[PDB]
Amino acid sequence: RIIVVALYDYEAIHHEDLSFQKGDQMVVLEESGEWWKARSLATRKEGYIPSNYVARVDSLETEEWFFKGISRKDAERQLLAPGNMLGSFMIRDSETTKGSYSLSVRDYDPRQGDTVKHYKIRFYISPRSTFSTLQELVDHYKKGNDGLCQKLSVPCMSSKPQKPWEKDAWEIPRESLKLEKKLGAGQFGEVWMATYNKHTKVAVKTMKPGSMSVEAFLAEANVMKTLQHDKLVKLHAVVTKEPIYIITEFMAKGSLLDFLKSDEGSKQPLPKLIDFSAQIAEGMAFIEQRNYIHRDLRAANILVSASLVCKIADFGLARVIEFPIKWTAPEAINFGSFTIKSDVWSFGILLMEIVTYGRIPYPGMSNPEVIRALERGYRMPRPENCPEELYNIMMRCWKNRPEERPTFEYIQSVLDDFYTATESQYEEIP
Template sequence: MLSLMDLVSVLQFLEEVLMSPCCLFRGLPVLSQKRGPSQTDRLCFTPTPAHPGGSWAGGSNHLRTWKWDSLQQLFSIWLCTVIPRMGCIKSKDSNTTGKSLGPPESTQTHYVKDPTSTVTMTKPERSSKHPREEGQEEVVLLALYDYDGVHPGDLTFRKGDHLLLKKESGEWWEACLISTGEEGFVPSNYVAYFNSLESEEWYFKGMSRKEAERQLLSPVNKSGAFMIRDSETMKGCFSLSVRDSGDTVKHYKIRTLDDGGFFISTRIPFPSLPELVRHYQGKVDGLCQCLTIPCQTVRPEKPWEKDAWEIPRESLSLQKKLGAGQFGDVWLAMYNGHTKVAVKTMKPGSMSPGAFLEEANLMKSLQHDRLVRLHAVVTQGEPIYIITEYMQKGSLLDFLKSQEGSDQPLIQLIDFSAQIAEGMWFIEQRNYIHRDLRAANCLVSETLLCKIADFGLARVIEDSEYTAREGTKFPIKWTSLEAANYGSFTIKSDVWSFGVLLTEIITYGRTPYPGMSNSEVITALERGYRMPCPSTCPKELYSIMLQCWQQDPEQRPTFEYLQSILEDFFTATETQYQAQP
């Protein structure tokens, strides 16, 4: 087997060969090493004026800091990059037919571009100039999951494949598969920069402490499952979250050294996070558990098809009726035969297409993990279709009333509440209003993630039975006094509704103000009446409800506060992070 120095010598020799004027591969860029924003190495092809063929950034001394496995990957990538380029799509004869990146020439459907998109998605342009001549970098990506292309221009790849990044464009990036030379679009959440921190299975960028606990406590993870995430309190530092025995998760702060190293315990520093992980996978050394495998998660949802906003009605196949609401039915449907979606079919006359489209454009721009994703619309003809992501367990109200829902412990009920507060905080930050927040308008995923749906729809409903206070469809029991009496809807009236939603959750879907009519509720509230504490409700949670029902809207809490207090409902008096081992 080659030694580390032997491999370095081979790489340097290959560079010299490439620099030779008679070299067959003359003009191809050479891999260089760049330090990425995550303080880890990623690979780039970097030509320079002094070395038009490219050079190793940092020189051979810097290269020697690479570990053996990194060098093996580096060498294989170099070889995979040179060979395909001799027959790359870009260098084929102009008469050769390659993979089409645009839609089929004869299409029976018409797609209207997403008006909220700030990115122009087009067929990837094949530059007549080589990136080396333009002084550009070509960055190597690592595939994190398998992906089978389903849209025109998609690139199919497998986990572990290497790709050259051509262009970052929102949710869909243009890339070239190194092993075949094929070019196309790839979902950006399915790839990461090669050899970056994001490419490590145990690194979860941007994940909060509470979300880490949700993920690690899912049934697929066992004791010793772990993740490393960014610290929420110390910029530039990290946290190690480990599932302990039982339903507990322990958190450890990973601090940085001045020279770039990392440590949990000051007595055991490490030059890199991968070495820290390898150490604690081999021994407990003060942690609650020996690290086993990275946290197992559900494969992320693929981004919605590029530019598909107002889509043809015939592209949807309604398969199963999921429920019936006041203004239409909800169906499970297949989009173009390959993507499961939920379709809300609005009753004819329930809203103006023009007013709905205006509101939908704003709704589409609100994208958050706790909001049901609005994918597309059908407004040509009636009924109007609203196409959203599909949530397997349906509405929170129906779930709570089901056998599975009624078996959920208090800790899960509080977690539902915290997740909804998180989504409403995002809406609050965007100066938006929901207007109809209740359990029926929240949906539950297969992994018990809760998302808010139908935000904004209440504003464009034209049904008098819904818009009038006396109407039978008006959700008066969830509506604040100022909104019911004067039509004054604000984020603070949403806070009132959230307090009522908490009673639905804690009583497993009981209708608020049981035994009282809408008019009786309004009269009682105006006299200062408030719903009594449900028998199964902790007094601390009831205290939060009463804060939400303050007569003065300005005295009601913010959703930021509600999220914080609900996330820490059981841990407010506990130490969140473990002492150094």
């Protein structure tokens, strides 16, 4: 008999899902992945709940200061998001020391600014002050920092998870959709802001009938479906009848390209710009890991969400299609040799795009002009706002030999800790 508890409020919007409040306990009846069958102990109604909205009671996830499955960098991203304050903390699964836990505390370093320190935990931090349960431990450091950068104040602002897509609805009838407002158009189709079943806001990429076979496209789209990651835009559904529709999550601030050119973009300081490209490297590192290829990496194909999380879009679409030579590796231009390494070349350009708030690559140069320019060994010069060490990375991405260019794993690893000396990742306690 398994009892779970609601971590967040939820309002039902389908035929057979349950509405519950934060705290309502429930009996699990089935575990079908994203959706679980359950019985509210509050209503006595049996229905479907979003599995990721509840956790076993007295389990750690139930706690407000615990964050399951969070990396150190993301732990550091959520503590620097507005709404938190000096002393804001959290406990999480440690990356390096598996099966153990780590403590992340907000802090102010008069020389860096707002930062986030991390401590490991074996339970105890300092063999001085030992503790029986993370609760005891937590409540301790809440009064007078026991040697910690700061004193534990308020748990980290937690977000409300996205609602899982309707149960078993990868392919939808076109009627389930109202494409309300057109956001963009182009050679291959448009992108619309849409609503799915009067209830769910979404984005739709409509594909002009090319060929680009339909059953050819759908094969890719089923692989596309399996490439899920916090840094890839999420494919919800597909309409399989020419003209094909691709239904995805709606990203509020549109393309990275468009965001960097806007007002809010222009205010973003350099450490933010760096973080953006770090997020994209994380996404590209995932694609690399899964032995996949993007083939059209650039600011235009990066989406920005309301909270400034970057997500790659159009991954794979490039393959299935049917003129951006400025983002393309010489080997891909000359012999059509698209690989993860040519993506890396792309990342280099996209990276310059970012640091120059979306300015076009090779300004004032034509495509032909640039193609010959590259053959002479020409590269874009470092912009003024650009740190020397960041430029050295672009240059590494633009090595004539693909084999010589770094991996996204390495690029991700470097960008993430750009301002943190390796020895300073975790703290050593007195």
